[PDB]
Amino acid sequence: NKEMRILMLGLDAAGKTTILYKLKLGQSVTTIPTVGFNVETVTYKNVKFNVWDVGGQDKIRPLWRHYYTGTQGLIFVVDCADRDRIDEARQELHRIINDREMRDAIILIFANKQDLPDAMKPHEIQEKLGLTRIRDRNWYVQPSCATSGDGLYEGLTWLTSNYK
Numbered sequence: 001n002k003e004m005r006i007l008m009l010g011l012d013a014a015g016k017t018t019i020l021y022k023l024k025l026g027q028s029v030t031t032i033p034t035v036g037f038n039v040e041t042v043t044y045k046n047v048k049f050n051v052w053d054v055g056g057q058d059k060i061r062p063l064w065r066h067y068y069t070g071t072q073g074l075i076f077v078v079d080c081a082d083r084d085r086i087d088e089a090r091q092e093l094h095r096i097i098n099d100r101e102m103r104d105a106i107i108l109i110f111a112n113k114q115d116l117p118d119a120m121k122p123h124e125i126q127e128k129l130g131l132t133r134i135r136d137r138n139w140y141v142q143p144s145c146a147t148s149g150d151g152l153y154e155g156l157t158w159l160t161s162n163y164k
């Protein structure tokens with residue numbers, strides 16, 4: 001089984017930690033705002049994903065840099081029902097990917113919380129996150145629901161599929 005270091009970032013409350021343990025434990029666990037980081041190795045399609053879950057609160061976003069070096073794939077998780085902060089998510093996203101340290105990272109977007117009445121569809125997120133305006137770079141917007149599991153594995157698959 002080949003290995004892949006995945007860094008997972010997003011605004012506070014996007015659902016990063018939930019994705020982590022749904023993937024790993026298969027259950028929907030109780031979480032708290034992440035202060036340091038979490039780490040689980042998830043093995044799917046003969047590949048060992050090394051997934052790092054980092055707190056998203058504003059004061060601790062400067063810590064994200066510490067984790068860049070090494071990362072082969074970025075998973076950026078978005079609350080799709082959080083219309084007030086999508087612009088903010090755009091910023092942070094672009095900061096990540098432009099840092100020389102992530103020049104060669106594959107970019108998986110989790111458009112999360114799709115179960116919620118205002119799902120702000122996948123195509124929306126894609127345009128609203130200024131992804132369309134990005135070529136010469138491997139990116140995909142996966143719809144998901146972290147509580148149920150929908151899209152999660154499908155995202156892992158894309159990272160498997162899109163890693164040379």
Ligand SMILES: Nc1nc2c(ncn2[C@@H]2O[C@H](COP(=O)(O)OP(=O)(O)OP(O)(O)=S)[C@@H](O)[C@H]2O)c(=O)[nH]1
Pocket residue numbers: 010011012013014015016017018019031032033034035054055056057077112113114115116144145146147148
């Ligand atoms: N309805 C719904 N709720 C979700 C979904 N994903 C996560 N949540 C809920 O949102 C809450 C916060 O998610 P969490 O996983 O802790 O965010 P986080 O990205 O880790 O946030 P932080 O630690 O960076 S501050 C949890 O109570 C969780 O159950 C989803 O797809 N749908």
Ligand SMILES: [Mg+2]
Pocket residue numbers: 016017032033034054055056
């Ligand atoms: Mg967290």
